[PDB]
């Protein structure tokens, strides 16, 4: 690299929230109305290197060796204001990011992406940023990014301002390690679609989202119970029903929406068939009709092959959970 050219490149993994983050309680600075609790997904993940130059005049973002639009551009430029500030420095990057996450198929690259960009921007600017100090610059990018700095289980703490809202690693004792999820490719419309505005619309006007207030605290408990435990059954049944409250409160917003369609819950039936076939699974849901499956490795492949009765090979994607968190890379 050049005499002063500073750079960094991290690798940065997907995370599924397992309890839910649904509604900020800041739009600005991403603090969300309430914790949530996620799984690090081995599979799929964001390579990103950023390359500081003292001659560049602006920043640049190629994303899968393209250029991006100059919206996505602005939005790059935004958040790289936060890193300079941070950093103490007016230097501007070129950004060279690697997306290998599955996102034509709907998975969210987001997390990954945020993660991936504030672990390197710290690595190559030596910012000697604490865990929790680079999840809440991660945050500051997208919510969930907070928690892909962390490997298996992960909690995103709510609290109520930029300093106290951030994740942390859980330790599960090698839980993490016993565990699988299986991504089902659910036939989707390809119009356009915003979960931080949907989640907006639900927070703001849901006649249904105080009852999601009431449960959530109560669903983070037990599910930190069960994995305390390493009881399966007990965190995939709290796990399922948080979802479904969230998506819930869609169809209690003004006006109402969903991300499911039937196809979606033909996957579903499918879960419920395989836990009457002891084979204990549970799904979840995000901003867009696929569904998760959390599943232990060990029943992992005969509830794959229960999917592939009814569905194409290509549509039915399994990943283990990655133990490590964000790493620094070559």
Same mark, same amino acid.
Request: aromatic letters at 8%.
């Given at each position: ?25 800041? $739009? ?20 990103? /290197? ?74 190559? #600017? ?133 991300? #499911? ?30 569904? /998760?499956?959390?599943? $232990? ?34």
């Amino acid at each position: 690299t050049g005499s002063m050219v500073k750079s960094g490149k991290a690798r940065a993994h997907t995370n599924i929230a397992l309890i839910k983050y649904w509604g900020k309680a800041d $739009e600005t600075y991403i603090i969300p109305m309430n914790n949530s609790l996620s799984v690090t997904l081995d599979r799929f993940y964001t390579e990103t /290197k950023v390359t500081f130059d003292p001659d560049f005049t602006e920043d640049c973002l190629i994303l899968n060796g393209n250029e991006v639009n100059a919206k996505e551009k602005e939005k790059i430029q935004n958040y790289m204001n936060i890193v300079r500030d941070l950093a103490g420095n007016r230097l501007h990057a070129r950004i060279e990011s690697e997306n290998y996450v599955p996102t034509a198929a709907g998975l969210a690259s987001s997390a990954s992406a945020y993660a991936a960009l504030a672990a390197a921007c710290n690595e190559a #600017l030596s910012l000697n940023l604490s865990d929790t100090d680079l999840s809440r610059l991660a945050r500051r990018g997208s919510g969930s990014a907070s928690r892909s700095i962390f490997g298996g289980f992960a909690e995103w703490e709510k609290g109520h301002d930029d300093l106290t809202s951030y994740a942390h690693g859980i330790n599960s004792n090698g839980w993490e390690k016993d565990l699988s999820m299986i991504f089902v490719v659910i036939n989707n419309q390809s119009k356009k679609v915003s979960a931080r505005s949907g989640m907006s619309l639900t927070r703001d006007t849901s006649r249904f989202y105080q009852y999601w207030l009431d449960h959530v605290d109560e669903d983070l408990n037990e599910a930190k119970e069960a994995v305390k435990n390493q009881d399966f059954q007990r965190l995939g049944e709290v796990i399922e029903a948080n979802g479904l409250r969230m998506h819930a409160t869609n169809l209690g917003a003004q006006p109402p929406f969903t991300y #499911l369609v039937q196809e979606s819950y033909d996957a579903m039936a499918i879960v419920e068939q395989c836990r009457k076939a002891n084979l204990p699974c549970y799904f979840t849901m995000d901003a867009g009709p696929n569904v /998760k499956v959390l599943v $232990e490795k060990k029943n992992k492949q005969a509830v794959m092959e229960q999917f592939l009765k009814v569905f194409d090979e290509s549509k039915i994607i399994a990943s283990d959970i990655i133990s490590s968190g964000v790493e620094i890379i070559k």
